[PDB]
Swiss-Prot record:
Lineage, highest ranks first: Eukaryota, Metazoa, Chordata, Craniata, Vertebrata
Full-sequence portion shown in this chain: 232 to 1726 of 1956
Superkingdom of the organism of origin: Eukaryota
Entry keyword annotation includes Transcription regulation: no
The protein's assembly and partners: The channel consists of an ion conducting pore forming alpha-subunit regulated by one or more associated auxiliary subunits SCN1B, SCN2B and SCN3B; electrophysiological properties may vary depending on the type of the associated beta subunits. Found in a number of complexes with PRX, DYNLT1 and PDZD2. Interacts with proteins such as FSTL1, PRX, DYNLT1, PDZD2, S100A10 and many others. Interacts with NEDD4 and NEDD4L.
Annotated compartments: Cell membrane
Organism whose genome encodes this protein: Homo sapiens (Human)
Extracellular side: 42-96, 122-128, 197-207, 260-265, 323-346, 368-376, 444-456, 511-514, 584-625, 648-663, 768-778, 833-844, 905-918, 942-969
Full protein name: Sodium channel protein type 10 subunit alpha
Disulfide bonds: 45-74, 369-378
Gene: SCN10A
Length: 998
């Protein structure tokens, strides 16, 4: 027992340092947030007229508004006041450290951090984007990387630790190579015929599909009969793949003999599994099948323990909270429906709740589970499931990732021009004329219409810039030469950009600025910032590194697309066009008509006596295979996963009003898709990526990636600083006056005392709350002097002792800086207390931030936190280059969105402050969706194409389609951005992982 106890202490010691780092960073950021905005979110609107709150369209909750300029304003007739109630159920805010640590925890884990990021900005202001980017990068991305690296190192160390029929049979053995190609082509054609379905399905089309299925079944059955006849059970049946083929074909002909053909729709797509037969031709698909098999096979024990854990947690939650869930339904249920959409009453819903927790969404059900049970018991269960659940899942993801993978005078002029081009006077000029040109696009926003001078200046700048670029291009042509220029890869990335701009501007100036293709091309002017990729050394290097994996990414992309086509043909069959519903739309907010009044289309048509009954489809549905792909991508990115998963369960059949959870068991389809097209299809992409960088690195022979030569030598210098830190030993003072001061300073317990004092300062900083007694305010202020005075005295003592000898140490300079900063902050506060200098309290609470600079002293005294911070220090250049590339991508998409969706109707995620009409708002939205959070909410107001959800007919300034977007371009934009950002962030994670690996 003692041996296993010690073993458990071990394998936790591995995460000891990372856990302490997480706790300390969370505490520091909690203190920063608490000081910045405490009890600020409780700023609901109240009508000047008891309490009168207005509600934002589409949401019953009150509207958090705040005083300031950046912060979100409030409708006329309302004054933002510190109404005493927190926005979400009264359970989310920064009014105290205990409520600030949890908010930062859920901001690190990223669960629904979109709401927090758009609330705290609405209240405090837009300028607070800095805190959120900092906590996401330094907090979320960094801490998850380090935890993943800890688990990876632990498990890597574990891994490396240890008659007539006979005549026909003779003639039936043709088995020509043409036969296998023919059968494979037959499989592909069967799939492509079964993958062309839709809502229309004219009778001729239905008959054609039926006869096609019949003939293909006939061919497959004839082939199986011929093979079994030619072979015997010992030869034919003995094969695993033959058994699979026989099972699928017999399940296809039995249903082909059923009364209701594939009425189940699970059997109408059971034959579709045969596409696995393409495993022979496809190595990547073979590897995917191997991944799944070994996950269920050799590595099946880990999955079994995961499943039993999830089942046990779901059962415990049900048994403990179902009675309260039923007794208090009205407390958490939606305004109209009588039951919560997600609850824990019966085992199925408890298991779905636990799966939602494991999926990365827990607070939404946490809050509600607090207003139906004791806060203590419901808080433990929700947190323990997350930590244990996400640890066990990431334990499988690595186990699968380590077993399947790795287990005349003209020529003189030409030469002169060639030499001139290489000159710095032109190179640097072009580099910063490519930066200014890219930057100038940010001012082309929707509000630009209101500043005629600004747009005129911008168009002058654009014309001059394109003229300059044409001159540069023709000079480069006349110097370098046609073949030399066109050989390079980037040379033509500039040529096509220049031509796009040229033809667009020529069309505009030719009084032909009305052609739809011309307008679309002009909308592609967001490609101008792309021109800065070649010039910058680091961005060019990272671009080359990324392009080095296109061959290794295309195969996995194709395999994922096929394995998703299967699930997009299973979903289209199970439920197509069955998502339509009859809604009642009185104001923005609408209530689907109860099935008592209208239960089908004609009823919703004859009872239109209210003037508002509407029959409209869900925004994301399963009508055809393209929408199936979109609705599977939303479930894979885990955003919009409920609007298309609620429609599924409430639908009954074609042209019938959805009923409350009639298809309560249709959640299994989405659960299965999540499992397979997620944990078993991203694991493939990741393994392929960790072998395409491991290769090409062993090929590079250790050459650093994402880094230039100057950055490499700087990295080497810093690596030496990792051992050069110590300076010469300090001589002891000779005179008693300085000698006694020195020998008192340098002592066994001096450092312990200073650390304890910093800990006490942290304690007295965290005891702070919102709206506390004036007595406690005075106490904190006075103890905020007992500490600043003491630290300044100690710093001046150590400065007097040893004179300039100690100044050589860098961190001594750092702590001197923090102490003098505290003194300066106190002086500034005292001076600003005057009657002449008065500003918002935010200025007080931001100047008071110097204390955290004064409590960062523990870093120099830390054990492993300092090592991890050193690793981050070394990795900074690589992450800087990748961040430059990511910001360039974000800028491209910002310009695209600003040009394309500045008129959509403000619904769901979009608001009056998170629109696309301004560059700041566009950057805010793109930063939010960079992690694929709320992208569904931003997409939904674009999918709308007709009334009432959007009014296609609406002046909308000059906006076309009124308040309705273009679903095709919206889907392309958002899907491309999320995929590209996933690639860039996984590059960042790989860079950090390898930097810590060294
Ligand atoms: C959706 C698809 C979901 C799961 C994949 C199922 C794979 C079916 C393979 C059919 C062909 C066959 O029978 O080939 C067995 C291979 C032969 O390969 P070999 O041993 O000769 O080498 O054997 C193996 O690799 C091991 C068996 C096949 C790969 C592991 C599959 C484990 C999944 C189990 C149940 C899935 C239920 C799906 C529910 C809807 C979703
Ligand atoms: C996995 C892939 C399967 C995807 C499709 C799963 C089933 C989709 C929905 C469906 O058509 O399911 C068939 C039935 C009904 O389901 P329902 O949602 O209409 O419930 C109706 C409840 N009522 C009758 C009280 C109103 O299922 C039932 O009778 C309940 C028992 C079976 C539930 C589906 C089991 C699928 C098994 C998956 C393991 C692999
Ligand atoms: C990047 C951001 C975050 C990660 C930091 C990673 C570690 C940074 C190490 C900084 C460092 O080593 O530089 C200390 C500096 C410069 O000294 P030196 O390195 O040239 O070595 C001098 C001694 N010789 C000559 C023997 C080499 O010391 C001085 O002079 C005084 C100035 C001290 C500045 C460094 C502070 C680094 C730690 C915290 C920054 C704030 C983080 C905030 C996070 C968000 C919370 C809201
Ligand atoms: C590992 C590597 C990454 C792998 C990722 C795989 C993800 C696969 C799914 C991607 C989304 C596909 C998707 O949304 O469907 C294709 C989309 C949507 O369909 P639609 O017919 O336009 O919809 C109805 C139509 N709008 C209408 O007018 O009613 O409409 C289109 O036809 C647009 C296709 C382009 C955008 C989506 C697919 C390609 C994305 C590539 C991004 C790569 C970035 C690097
Ligand atoms: C939409 O749903 C409604 C209600 O289900 C359908 O109307 C219904 O039509 C049926 C068949 O005519 C009616 O059944 C009949 O009821 C009368 C007595 O009212 C009885 O004498 C007949 O023998 C038969 O049982 C049903 O009552 C009627 N319900 C109502 C209130 O309208 C409607 O046809 C559906 N429309 C579509 C196209 O989905
Ligand atoms: C129930 O009755 C209402 C009212 O007739 C129907 O709404 C109507 O829907 C049509 C088609 O969407 C609308 O046509 C267009 O509407 C826009 C926006 O008003 C307008 O700009 C166009 O000129 C054109 O009229 C129609 O206006 C709209 N009428 C109203 C006032 O709602 C609804 O479709 C009916 N629903 C059912 C299921 O019977
Ligand atoms: C479906 O939508 C319609 C239209 O919004 C709803 O009817 C509307 O109900 C409101 C009351 O919530 C009516 O406003 C007021 O009603 C009171 C009734 O005493 C009246 O005294 C006021 O002068 C005022 O009219 C509104 O007029 C009425 N509009 C109509 C005629 O459709 C309907 O209740 C909704 N039904 C469901 C089940 O969602
Ligand atoms: C580092 C950690 C994160 C710190 C927070 C993120 C970075 O700090 C944001 C604040 O500095 C914004 O400036 P103020 O505090 O002056 O707020 C604006 C107030 N007026 C000027 C409009 C009245
Ligand atoms: C991927 C697999 C190959 C491509 C499969 C492509 O799917 C083709 C279907 O979408 C065609 O039908 P629609 O969705 O255009 O529906 C027709 C709507 N009307 C004509 C009835 C109005
Ligand atoms: C690659 C895939 C090739 C797929 C070839 O697609 C052929 C058909 O799906 C075309 O169908 P339509 O888009 O014309 O829809 C007609 C539907 N109604 C009007 C008859 C109902
Ligand atoms: C997949 C491979 C390619 C397959 C191509 C299939 C082409 C054949 C299917 O194309 C569909 C169109 O012909 C229209 O749909 P129908 O054939 O049902 O005719 C209905 C006509 N109305 C009612 C719309 C006027
Ligand atoms: C949204 C994009 C995010 C970034 C990732 C995706 C990038 C896609 C590709 C964009 C750039 C495509 C052109 C640049 C990539 C290829 C080039 C990538 O770097 C070029 C070096 O590999 C080779 O140098 P050069 O091509 O200048 O010339 C050397 C001699 N050879 C190579 C010509 C024989
Ligand atoms: C089996 C255990 C349960 C697994 C739950 C599901 C575990 O996560 C599923 C992943 O597919 C989620 O992917 P990400 O969150 O990384 O988003 C990336 C989306 N794209 C960019 C790849 C499309
Ligand atoms: C309802 C449909 C669409 C989804 C479920 C598909 C199921 C039934 C599939 C996926 C995994 C498949 C099995 C995979 C492996 C083997 C072993 C082989 O020696 C015979 C076939 C057999 C036993 C398959 C039978 C069919 C199977 C169980
Ligand atoms: C049409 C206008 C706007 C832009 C024209 C850009 C032209 C010159 C660019 C666009 C894409 C380029 C091609 C992209 C990739 C390759 C493969 C390489 O192995 C040989 C050159 C070749 C074939 C390039 C030749 C130049 C090219 C065709
Ligand atoms: C190691 C310790 C500090 C970890 C945290 C301990 C717990 C008990 C801390 C976390 C936040 C703390 C609270 C933060 C702020 C206030 C307001 C103050 O006017 C009274 C104390 C009170 C209400 C604190 C009580 C103790 C508290 C709940």
């Amino acid at each position: 027992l003692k041996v296993i106890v010690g073993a458990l202490i071990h394998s936790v010691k591995k995460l000891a340092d990372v856990t302490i780092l997480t706790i300390f960073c969370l505490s520091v950021f909690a203190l920063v947030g608490l000081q910045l905005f405490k009890g600020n979110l409780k700023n609901k609107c109240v009508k000047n007229d008891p309490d009168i709150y207005i509600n934002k369209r589409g949401t019953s909750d009150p509207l958090l508004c705040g005083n300031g300029s950046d912060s979100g304003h409030c409708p006329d007739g309302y004054i933002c006041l510190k109404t005493s109630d927190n926005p979400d159920f009264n359970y989310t805010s920064f009014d105290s450290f205990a409520w600030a640590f949890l908010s930062l925890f859920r901001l690190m884990t990223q669960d629904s951090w979109e709401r927090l990021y758009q609330q705290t900005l609405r209240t405090s202001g837009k300028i607070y984007m800095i805190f959120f980017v900092l906590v996401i990068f330094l907090g979320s991305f960094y801490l998850v990387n380090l935890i993943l690296a800890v688990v990876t190192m632990a498990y890597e160390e574990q891994n490396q630790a240890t008659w007539v029929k006979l005549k026909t049979i003779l003639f039936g053995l043709v088995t020509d190579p043409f036969a296998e190609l023919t059968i494979t082509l037959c499989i592909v054609v069967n799939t492509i015929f079964m993958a062309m379905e839709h809502h229309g399905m004219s009778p001729t089309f239905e008959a054609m599909l039926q006869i096609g299925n019949i003939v293909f079944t006939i061919f497959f059955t004839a082939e199986m009969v011929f093979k079994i006849i030619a072979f015997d059970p010992y030869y034919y049946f003995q094969k695993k793949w033959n058994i699979f083929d026989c099972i699928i074909v017999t399940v296809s002909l039995l249903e082909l003999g059923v009364a209701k053909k594939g009425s189940l729709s699970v059997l109408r797509s059971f034959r579709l599994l045969r596409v696995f037969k393409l495993a022979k031709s496809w190595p990547t698909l073979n590897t995917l099948i191997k991944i799944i098999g070994n996950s269920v096979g050799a590595l099946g024990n880990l999955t079994i323990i995961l499943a039993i854990i999830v089942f046990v947690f779901a059962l415990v939650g049900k048994q403990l909270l179902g009675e309260n869930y039923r007794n208090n339904r009205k407390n958490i249920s939606a305004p109209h429906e009588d039951w919560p959409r997600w609850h824990m009453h019966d085992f199925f819903h408890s298991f779905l709740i636990v799966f939602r927790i494991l999926c990365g969404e827990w607070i939404e059900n946490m809050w509600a589970c607090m207003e139906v049970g004791q806060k203590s018991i419901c808080l433990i269960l929700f947190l323990t499931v997350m930590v244990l659940g996400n640890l066990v899942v990431l334990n499988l993801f690595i186990a699968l990732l380590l077993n399947s993978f790795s287990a005349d005078v003209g020529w003189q002029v030409r030469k002169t021009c060639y030499r001139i081009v290489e000159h710095s006077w032109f190179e640097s000029f072009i580099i910063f004329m490519i930066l200014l040109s890219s930057g100038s696009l940010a001012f082309e926003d929707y509000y630009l219409d209101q500043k005629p001078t600004v747009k005129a200046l911008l168009e002058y700048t654009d014309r001059v810039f394109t003229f300059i670029f044409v001159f540069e291009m023709l000079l480069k042509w006349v110097a370098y030469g046609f073949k030399k220029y066109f050989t390079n890869a980037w040379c033509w990335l500039d040529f096509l950009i220049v031509n796009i701009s040229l033809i667009s501007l020529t069309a505009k100036i030719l009084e032909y600025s009305e052609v739809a293709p011309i307008k679309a091309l002009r909308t592609l002017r967001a490609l101008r910032p792309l021109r800065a990729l070649s010039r910058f050394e680091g961005m060019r290097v990272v671009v080359d590194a990324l392009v080095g994996a296109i061959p290794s990414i295309m195969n996995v992309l194709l395999v994922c697309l096929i394995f998703w086509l299967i699930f997009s043909i299973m979903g289209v069959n199970l439920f197509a066009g069955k998502f339509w519903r009859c809604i009642n739309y009185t104001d923005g907010e609408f209530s689907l008509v109860p099935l008592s009044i209208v239960n089908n289309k004609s009823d919703c048509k004859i009872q239109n006596s209210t003037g508002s009954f509407f029959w409209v489809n869900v925004k994301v549905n399963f009508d055809n295979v393209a929408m199936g792909y979109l609705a599977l991508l939303q479930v894979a990115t885990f955003k919009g996963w409920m609007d298309i998963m609620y429609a599924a369960v409430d639908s009954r059949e074609v042209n019938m009003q959805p009923k409350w959870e009639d298809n309560v068991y249709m959640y299994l389809y989405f659960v299965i898709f999540i499992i397979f097209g997620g944990f078993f299809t991203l694991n493939l992409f990741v393994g392929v990526i960790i072998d395409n960088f491991n290769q090409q690195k062993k090929k590079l022979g250790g050459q650093d990636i994402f880094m230039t030569e100057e950055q490499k030598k700087y990295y080497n210098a810093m690596k030496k600083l990792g051992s050069k830190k110590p300076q010469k030993p300090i001589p002891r003072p000779l005179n008693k006056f300085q000698g006694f001061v020195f020998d008192i300073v340098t002592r066994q317990a001096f450092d312990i005392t200073i650390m304890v004092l910093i800990c006490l300062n942290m304690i007295t900083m965290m005891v702070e709350t919102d709206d506390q007694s004036e007595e406690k305010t005075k106490i904190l202020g006075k103890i905020n002097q007992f500490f600043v005075a003491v630290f300044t005295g100690e710093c001046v003592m150590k400065m007097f002792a040893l004179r300039q000898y100690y100044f050589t140490n860098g961190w001594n300079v750092f702590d001197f800086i923090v102490v003098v900063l505290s003194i300066a902050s106190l002086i500034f506060s005292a001076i600003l207390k005057s009657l002449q200098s008065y500003f918002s309290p935010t200025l007080f609470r931001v100047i008071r931030l110097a204390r955290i600079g004064r409590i960062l002293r523990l870093i120099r005294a830390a054990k492993g936190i300092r090592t991890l911070l050193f690793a981050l220090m070394m990795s900074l250049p690589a992450l800087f280059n990748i961040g430059l590339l990511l910001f360039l991508v974000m800028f491209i998409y910002s310009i695209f969105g600003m040009s394309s969706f500045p008129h959509v109707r403000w619904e769901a995620g979009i608001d009056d402050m998170f629109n696309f009409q301004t560059f700041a708002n566009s950057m805010l939205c793109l930063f939010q969706i960079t992690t694929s959070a709320g992208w569904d909410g931003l997409l939904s107001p674009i999918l709308n194409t007709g009334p009432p959800y959007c009014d296609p007919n609406l002046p909308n300034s000059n906006g076309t389609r009124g308040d309705c977007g273009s679903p095709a371009v919206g889907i392309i934009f958002f899907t491309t951005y999320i995929i590209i950002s996933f690639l860039i962030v996984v590059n960042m994670y790989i860079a950090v992982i390898l930097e810590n690996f060294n």
